[PDB]
Structure 1
Amino acid sequence: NKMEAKIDELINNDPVWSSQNESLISKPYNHILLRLNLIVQINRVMNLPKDQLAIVSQIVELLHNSSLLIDDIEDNAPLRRGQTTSHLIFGVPSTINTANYMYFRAMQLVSQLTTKEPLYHNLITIFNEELINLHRGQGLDIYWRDFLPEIIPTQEMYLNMVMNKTGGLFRLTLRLMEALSPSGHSLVPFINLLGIIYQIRDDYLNLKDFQMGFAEDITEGKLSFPIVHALNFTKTKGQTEQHNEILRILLLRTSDKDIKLKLIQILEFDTNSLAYTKNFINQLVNMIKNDNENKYLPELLYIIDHLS
C-alpha cells in the first residue's frame, strides 16, 4: 500500500533527473571540451545580434564536438588533438550515448533562437536536413572503408560524399545564420567550397605531415582524396600490382611506420597522387582568391589558410 502510493507519486510526475546525474553522463563530452572566428566573419554579412549569435555558436559547438566523439569511435581513433580519445577513457557505450544526447540538447537550443513560429519551423528543418546529410556522407565513407574492395569510389563519388559529410556542418551553420539575418546572394556555394577544401586538405596533410602526423588515415583504411586518386589511376593505367598493394595496405589497418611510409611513397612516385591533390587544393583555393566579381565571396582568406 505504501508501495502503491510511492508508485502513484512516481508515474504522475515527470522523470526525476538530478544535476548530479547530468554530470555523471557528461564525462565523455567534458573531456573533448579540453572557428568562433568563422561564425564571427560570416556575421559581418549576416548581422545577427550578439545574443542570437551566441546560441547559434552553442548549437554548432555541441554538434561539432558530438560528431567528433562518434567519429573517433567509428574510426577507432586513439587520439584527438594530441590527447586520448573519450571512448578509450570512458568506454564506447557511455561515449555513444553522451554524444547522441548532445545532438538532442543542441536541437533543444534552436527554440531559444526565436519566439516566432514560422521562423522556428524553418530553423528546425534546416537542423534536421543537414544532420540527415551529415549521416548520409558519414555512412558512405564508413561503408566504403569497412567493405573495401566492394566499392572503389571515383573522384566524383568522393566529392559527393564530402558535400554531405563535411559540407553538412558548414551549411548548417550558414543556413541557420542566413535564416536569422535581419539584414546579397546566398553563401551556401562558398561554404560548400570551403567544406570541400577543408576535407581534401585534411586528407592531404594527414599523409604529407607524416612523409615530411602519424598518417592515421592509412591505419584507418579511409578512402581519402589521395587514395581515391591512386586507386582510380592504377586501375586506369593498368598498374595491377600497385592497385592491389594499395588495397592490401589499407586492409591491414596497420600502425607499422614503414608500411604506411611505403604506401605514401607509392602515392608520391608511382601514382603522383600527392602532387595531384596538392594542385587540386590550389585550384579550388584560387577559385575563391580569383573571383574578383565576388561570384562566391560576399579577411576570408586568413580563414581559408587556417581551415585546418
Structure 2
Amino acid sequence: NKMEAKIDELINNDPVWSSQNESLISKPYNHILLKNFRLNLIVQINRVMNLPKDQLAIVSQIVELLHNSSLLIDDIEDNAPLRRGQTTSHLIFGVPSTINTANYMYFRAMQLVSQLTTKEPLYHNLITIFNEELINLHRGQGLDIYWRDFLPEIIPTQEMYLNMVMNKTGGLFRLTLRLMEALSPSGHSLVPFINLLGIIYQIRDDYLNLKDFQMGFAEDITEGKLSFPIVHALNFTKTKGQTEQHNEILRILLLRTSDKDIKLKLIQILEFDTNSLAYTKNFINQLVNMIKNELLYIIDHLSEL
C-alpha cells in the first residue's frame, strides 16, 4: 500500500528533474562554450531588419545553441580531436553524452522560438522556418558525410558540392536571416546574399585549412573530406587523364592520415599538378567581387563565425 501510494504519486505528476541533473548532463555543452562575431553579423543585419533588442537577443540565443550543438555533433562525425585549439567534448565526456547533450540543445533552441512572439500565425511561420532549415542542414551534412565515408563510390562534381553547401552551410545562415525577416516590423529579401555569404564562408574555410598548413594541421585531409579544392582536383585529374594522380588523391584521403609529410605531398599535388589552390583562391575572390561590386569587415573576419 505504501509502494502503490508512492507509484501513484509518481505517475500523477510531471517527471522529476533537478537543477543538479541539468548541470550534470550539460557538461559537453558548457565545455564548447569556452571556445561575438556571430553577434556582430546579426547586429549588422538588424540595421536592416530593426527587431527590438529583446527579440534580437532571443534570436541570437537560438543561433548559439544550434551552432554549438552542430559543432559538438560535427566533431564526433569527423573524429576531430581539437576545436579552437582545445580538446573536443566527445574525447572528454564520451561520444554518448555528447550526442545526447547536443541533441537536447536542439530542442531547447526549439523551445525558445515560442518566446519570440505571442501571435499564433507568426509563431507557426517561425517554427516552420526552424523546421525547414534544420531539415536542410541534416540533408547537406548527410551528403558530405556519405561522400567522405563511402569514397570512391561517389566523386562529387563542383555543382554537387555547391548544392550540398547550400543545404549544409546555408542552413544556419538562412535560418537566422529568415527568422529575422519574418519578425521585422519594417527592400528585397536578403536570402540570396546570405546564401552567398554561407558559400564564401565554406569554400574559404576549406581553402584556409590547406593554405595555412602549406605556409593549422590541414585536418580536413586526415578526415578525408571532399573539400572544394579536393573536388576540383579530383575532377581536373579525371578530365585530363591524370590517372595516377587521381588515384593517389583518393588513396591519401582514404588513409585518414595524420602524417604531415603525406598531407604536404597532397597539398603540393593540389598546388603544382592540378592548380586547385589557385583555382579556389580565384573562385573565392570572384564570389567576394559579386558583393563588393561593416560588410567588408564581416567578410574579412568570415573565418571567425
TM-score, normalised to structure 2, is 0.98
Secondary structure of 1:13's aligned partner: coil
Q: How much does 1:301 deviate?
A: 1.3
Deviations 1:147-200 (A, max 9, x none): 000000000000000000000000000000000001110000000000000000
Q: How much does 1:16 deviate?
A: 0.1
Deviations 1:16-57 (A, max 9, x none): 000000000000000000010000000000000000000000
Task: Check if 1:264 corresponds to 2:259.
Answer: no
Deviations 1:267-297 (A, max 9, x none): 0000000000000000000000xxxxxxxxx
Cα distance in 1 for residues equivalent to 2:207 and 2:217: 12
Deviations 1:110-168 (A, max 9, x none): 00000000000000000000000000000000000000000000000000000000000
Q: 1:147: which partner in 2? A: 150
1:59 pairs with one of 59, 62, 65: 62
Q: How much does 1:258 deviate?
A: 0.1
Cα distance in 1 for residues equivalent to 2:300 and 2:177: 19
Task: Check if 1:89 corresponds to 2:92.
Answer: yes
Q: 1:24: which partner in 2? A: 24
- 1:7-18 matches, cutoff 5 A: 7-18=7-18
Cα distance in 1 for residues equivalent to 2:121 and 2:246: 54
Q: How much does 1:13 deviate?
A: 0.3
Cα distance in 2 for residues equivalent to 1:208 and 1:134: 27
Deviations 1:71-92 (A, max 9, x none): 0000000000000000000000
Structure 1: unaligned runs, 5 residues or longer: 289-298
Secondary structure of 2:152's aligned partner: coil
Q: How much does 1:98 deviate?
A: 0.1
Cα distance in 2 for residues equivalent to 1:281 and 1:213: 20
Task: Check if 1:188 corresponds to 2:183.
Answer: no
Aligned length: 298
Cα distance in 1 for residues equivalent to 2:99 and 2:222: 22
Cα distance in 2 for residues equivalent to 1:188 and 1:237: 37
Secondary structure of 2:14's aligned partner: coil
Q: 1:300: which partner in 2? A: 295
Structure 2: unaligned runs, 5 residues or longer: none
Cα distance in 2 for residues equivalent to 1:26 and 1:109: 17
Q: 2:209: which partner in 1? A: 206
Secondary structure of 2:26's aligned partner: helix
The runs of at least 4 aligned residues of structure 1 exceeding 6 Å deviation read none
Q: How much does 1:252 deviate?
A: 0.1
Secondary structure of 1:153's aligned partner: coil
Secondary structure of 2:187's aligned partner: coil
Secondary structure of 1:184's aligned partner: coil
